[PDB]
Structure 1
Amino acid sequence: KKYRPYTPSRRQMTTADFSGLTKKRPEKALTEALPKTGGRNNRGRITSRFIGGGHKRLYRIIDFKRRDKSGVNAKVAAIEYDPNRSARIALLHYADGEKRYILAPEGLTVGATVNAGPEAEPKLGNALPLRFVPVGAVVHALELVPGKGAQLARSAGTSVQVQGKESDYVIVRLPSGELRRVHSECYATIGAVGNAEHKNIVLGKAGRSRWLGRKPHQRGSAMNPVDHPHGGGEGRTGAGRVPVTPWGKPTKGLKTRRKRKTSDRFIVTR
């Protein structure tokens, strides 16, 4: 009884609890193609990760933003949800050669303009150098790759405030990693998310997604004397700050040193 819009959150019905999905869409026929791709689940003569890993693969396809531009004039109209994650994915337009999925701020009916050109339009735009951040509203297209540029693919967050301008030239915050001023020299598409919260919005029950895309997990403690200690008591656990094969359940920190994060401090989470 709050956000936009229709969340199948059935307040206890019949084998379909408080769901939560979709929105509006013009409904597109079906995607024209899907370069390269391949698949999922497992790899390298083995398998890896025993959590999730359903049926439906691919669909996502690349989304190379702006590698060139120099003068384009686009338009935008339709749109289409598709990648592995519920996040929509826009629909772009133009008429030159390729398509390249493009990003999508908030939803639109029948209009727009677009230019993708350094100094162009207040509204929706694309390609342009980086110093262009007076206010720095919703981004939803950030990226780290000089010639390239893409990154994110999720309807979660996608909104960063840009810092000032001092030595070492560092600015812009990031989704959820507090205070970590990153070095920067690229671009994005600056636009909203469309159904922000809509990314981890609850489902009814279990058995219509976890198989149907991903896989059935909520486990722990193998109770396996061999490499899995957790398991061998009257029904308690006693001591043992162990997770699995003594992997340290607690923080224990991790990656540091590194290229970057050598002048990109402050990354602590609460």
Structure 2
Amino acid sequence: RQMTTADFSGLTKKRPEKALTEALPKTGGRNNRGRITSRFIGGGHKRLYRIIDFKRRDKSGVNAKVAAIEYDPNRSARIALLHYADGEKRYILAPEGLTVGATVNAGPEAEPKLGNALPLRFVPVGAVVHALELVPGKGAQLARSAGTSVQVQGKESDYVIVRLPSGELRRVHSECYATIGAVGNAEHKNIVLGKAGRSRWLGRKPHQRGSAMNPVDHPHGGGEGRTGAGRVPVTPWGKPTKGLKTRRKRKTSDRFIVT
């Protein structure tokens, strides 16, 4: 769903369940000491951080009930505020179809039902999960985003195959946790973003094409009128395919990375 109109815009999103409740402050910044390292990003409106439970282990064997499903900035992911029988309230990112006031059990013996958050060896094949723990313990580095999913494929010994959103297949051992279902935030992607400055509500001041800069500034800089040569960034690497990975440990846990 979206808003639609005339007066010069397109497509805002729409949300239920509103609270404004309980976690740490965050503070915007771009440069890191001297010259800005991660480029642009100097704008933005005043976000706060929400501590979110990726690990979800020590709550093992303990059921919970969804309080509400809340909007969080810095996210693109619906978050469900969980409350446990323990009394402990914990923010857990909300998947598609996860209702308000549903009940989500934690722990390994919990059924592959929505949100139930179990390890892979107990997850029946083909099933869809999100928030995938990479190395047992720690937390989920995989599929934390909107509409992003992972599909379990037949395991090995302690190890399982998974199809990540990129399409790449990964070896990930079954000792790792995961959450059942895919994390929607509906379809975030088709938001229109309207006009500029909206891109500025959040990140800041997007691409400055090197081709308008000067020979001193960028490789693309210089000349008379709009043109090209080369094909390359801040430093001469290029737009198109150059494998940027280094030959490494991880690389033996990847089977058919394609796209």
Give the TM-score taking structure 1 as reference length: 0.76
Q: Specify every segment of 5 or more residues in structure 1 that has no aligned partner in the other structure, as ranges.
A: 1-10
Q: Note the C-alpha offset of 1:135.
A: 3.7
Contact 1:182 1:264 in 2 (8 A): no
1:61 matched to 2:68: no
Aligned partner of residue 131 in structure 1, secondary structure: helix
Q: Note the C-alpha offset of 1:85.
A: 3.0
Kindly provide the CA deviation profile for residues 134-161 of structure 1, in whole angstroms up to 9, marking residues without a partner as x. 2443322112132222335754342222
**Alpha-carbon spacing, 1:230–1:132, altered in 2? closer, same or farther (3 Å):** same
**Alpha-carbon spacing, 1:136–1:101, altered in 2? closer, same or farther (3 Å):** farther
Q: Specify every segment of 5 or more residues in structure 2 that has no aligned partner in the other structure, as ranges.
A: none
Distance in structure 1 (CA, Å) of the matches to 2:179 and 2:234: 42
Q: Note the C-alpha offset of 1:129.
A: 3.3
Kindly provide the CA deviation profile for residues 27-85 of structure 1, in whole angstroms up to 9, marking residues without a partner as x. 32311232787866645785541256523244243423313134312111311010313
Distance in structure 1 (CA, Å) of the matches to 2:61 and 2:212: 59
Contact 1:103 1:189 in 2 (8 A): no
Contact 1:138 1:160 in 2 (8 A): yes
Q: Note the C-alpha offset of 1:24.
A: 5.0
Kindly provide the CA deviation profile for residues 204-223 of structure 1, in whole angstroms up to 9, marking residues without a partner as x. 21123414553343533253
Q: Note the C-alpha offset of 1:197.
A: 2.4
Answer 1 or 2: higher relative contact order, Cα 8 Å, separation at least 6: 1
**Alpha-carbon spacing, 1:87–1:119, altered in 2? closer, same or farther (3 Å):** same
- Larger mean Cα displacement after TM superposition, 70-79 or 229-238: 229-238
Contact 2:26 2:49 in 1 (8 A): no
**Alpha-carbon spacing, 1:17–1:220, altered in 2? closer, same or farther (3 Å):** farther
Q: How many residues align?
A: 259
Contact 2:162 2:171 in 1 (8 A): yes
Q: Note the C-alpha offset of 1:263.
A: 3.8
State the percentage of identical aligned residues.
Answer: 100
Contact 1:173 1:182 in 2 (8 A): no
Structure with a larger share of its residues in helix: 2
Q: Alpha carbon RMSD of aligned pairs, Å?
A: 3.7
Distance in structure 1 (CA, Å) of the matches to 2:88 and 2:30: 26
Q: Note the C-alpha offset of 1:109.
A: 4.9
Aligned partner of residue 74 in structure 1, secondary structure: strand
Give the TM-score taking structure 2 as reference length: 0.79
Contact 1:177 1:268 in 2 (8 A): yes
Contact 2:2 2:14 in 1 (8 A): no
Distance in structure 1 (CA, Å) of the matches to 2:90 and 2:2: 42
Contact 1:130 1:185 in 2 (8 A): yes
Contact 2:119 2:176 in 1 (8 A): yes
Aligned partner of residue 188 in structure 1, secondary structure: strand
Give the aligned partner of residue 91 of structure 1.
81
Contact 2:218 2:234 in 1 (8 A): yes
